[PDB]
Amino acid sequence: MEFKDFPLKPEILEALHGRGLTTPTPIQAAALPLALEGKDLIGQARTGTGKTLAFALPIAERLAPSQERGRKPRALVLTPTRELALQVASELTAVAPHLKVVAVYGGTGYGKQKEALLRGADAVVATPGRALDYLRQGVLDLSRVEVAVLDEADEMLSMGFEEEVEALLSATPPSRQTLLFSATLPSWAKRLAERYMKNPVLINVIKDEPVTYEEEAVPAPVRGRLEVLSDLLYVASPDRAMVFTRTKAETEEIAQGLLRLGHPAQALHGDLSQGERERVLGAFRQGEVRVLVATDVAARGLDIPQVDLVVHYRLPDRAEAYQHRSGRTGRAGRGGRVVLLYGPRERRDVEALERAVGRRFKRVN
Ligand SMILES: Nc1ncnc2c1ncn2[C@@H]1O[C@H](COP(=O)(O)O)[C@@H](O)[C@H]1O
Numbered sequence: 001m002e003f004k005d006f007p008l009k010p011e012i013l014e015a016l017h018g019r020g021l022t023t024p025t026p027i028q029a030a031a032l033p034l035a036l037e038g039k040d041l042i043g044q045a046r047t048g049t050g051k052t053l054a055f056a057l058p059i060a061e062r063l064a065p066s067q068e069r070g071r072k073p074r075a076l077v078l079t080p081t082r083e084l085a086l087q088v089a090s091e092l093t094a095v096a097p098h099l100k101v102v103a104v105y106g107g108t109g110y111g112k113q114k115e116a117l118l119r120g121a122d123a124v125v126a127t128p129g130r131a132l133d134y135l136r137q138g139v140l141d142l143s144r145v146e147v148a149v150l151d152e153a154d155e156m157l158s159m160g161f162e163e164e165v166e167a168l169l170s171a172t173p174p175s176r177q178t179l180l181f182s183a184t185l186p187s188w189a190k191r192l193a194e195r196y197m198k199n200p201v202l203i204n205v206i207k208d209e210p211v212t213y214e215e216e217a218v219p220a221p222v223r224g225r226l227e228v229l230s231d232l233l234y235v236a237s238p239d240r241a242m243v244f245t246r247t248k249a250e251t252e253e254i255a256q257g258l259l260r261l262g263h264p265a266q267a268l269h270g271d272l273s274q275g276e277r278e279r280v281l282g283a284f285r286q287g288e289v290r291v292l293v294a295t296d297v298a299a300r301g302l303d304i305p306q307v308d309l310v311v312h313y314r315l316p317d318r319a320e321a322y323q324h325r326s327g328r329t330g331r332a333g334r335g336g337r338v339v340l341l342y343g344p345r346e347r348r349d350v351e352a353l354e355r356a357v358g359r360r361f362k363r364v365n
Pocket residue numbers: 021022023024025028046047048049050051052053333
């Protein structure tokens with residue numbers, strides 16, 4: 001079905017078509033029928049899936065225009081970062097020209113956002129900390145919210161916003177539509193689905209997502225590869241990074257090496273107990289650990305957070321392994337980056353990978 005085939009108001013369709021948007025992405029095609037009818041859903045998606053429009057369109061269609069001075073918002077979208085709040089606010093503004101969208105975030109003054117809220121708003125796109133400040137001030141009123149969106153729930157959890165998110169949702173009416181989007185579903189997300197949502201349908205598009213990350217094949221010697229990795233990590237300065245290697249022993253050697261060189265790194269391998277694995281992934285999610293060095297076996301699962309950089313320390317054996325590793329990159333609206341380290345010997349190994357993947361990697365020449 002094209003967008004014109006969905007039940008959308010004439011102005012909304014015209015806005016889509018003006019931007020050359022005609023055909024829903026998979027998450028949009030699956031979510032729209034439920035979302036347009038005000039039902040709750042969990043959208044398990046990563047990068048470049050079009051999840052923003054999957055909630056912006058229902059907000060646009062469900063909310064009628066209002067010119068009431070000082071009006072309270074009827075939609076709340078919560079995002080983990082200022083960067084994402086700005087991108088989402090921008091998209092919602094273009095999808096719904098009839099709604100006043102207000103972006104709310106910290107790092108700046110309180111004055112301009114306060115004035116905008118007081119003037120009247122239809123939708124608020126906010127980081128949870130600043131939204132909560134305005135709520136307690138009495139500036140942001142959420143009693144008329146009809147749609148609440150949690151965009152990247154697992155990352156809000158990682159930024160320490162869990163209690164803020166729950167407070168904000170509790171300030172909205174219980175008849176609200178709730179839409180939750182997240183790459184992973186940790187315990188806190190499942191608690192939300194249970195206590196803050198109404199039997200949401202889960203739609204998981206992980207297996208049908210476009211490649212959004214930058215890929216670079218980097219020639220690197222076997223000897224002293226650790227220093228090469230460490231310098232790359234300092235230069236790139238990712239908030240979270242995952243480094244893949246072949247064996248358990250390697251994950252230990254590398255994690256310990258990176259720790260010695262100043263990186264908060266930990267090994268993730270198959271011989272850890274569930275306690276050990278839970279603590280590692282928990283520390284990773286929380287930011288206490290920022291580099292995870294893992295084997296392919298240990299990284300299988302839904303409990304692994306998205307990262308900003310994936311490094312292939314050894315080459316993957318197969319295209320399947322390459323994609324499983326590399327798909328972990330990209331969070332918070334950013335496409336992320338993948339680096340394949342390869343030695344003097346492995347040129348054809350890389351070419352075979354490219355052939356199998358059906359995609360050429362950028363050569364650092
Ligand atoms: N139906 C669509 N057709 C083509 N591109 C889209 C569509 N929906 C969203 N996009 C774009 O896909 C990118 C990824 O969106 P998101 O996954 O929401 O960050 C953004 O640049 C969107 O503008």
